[PDB]
Amino acid sequence: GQYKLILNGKTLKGETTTEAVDAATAEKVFKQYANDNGMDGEWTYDDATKTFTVTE
């Protein structure tokens, strides 16, 4: 399925999407991406909209 990430960092903002087998997998992909971009934020996940957020 399609999952969305809202990037709400101090320096990186916007949105990205990934196809993942489940939400746990999307979470790992998105957290790795955030880590690789030096983010350090608080996270949410909304299963109704398949949307993660990372906020600094």
Curated annotation (Swiss-Prot):
The organism's superkingdom is given as Bacteria
Cysteines paired by S-S bonds: none
Q: Give residue ranges of the sequence repeats.
A: 3-56
| Subcellular localization | Secreted, Cell wall
Protein name per its UniProtKB record: Immunoglobulin G-binding protein G
User: Which species?
Assistant: Streptococcus sp. group G
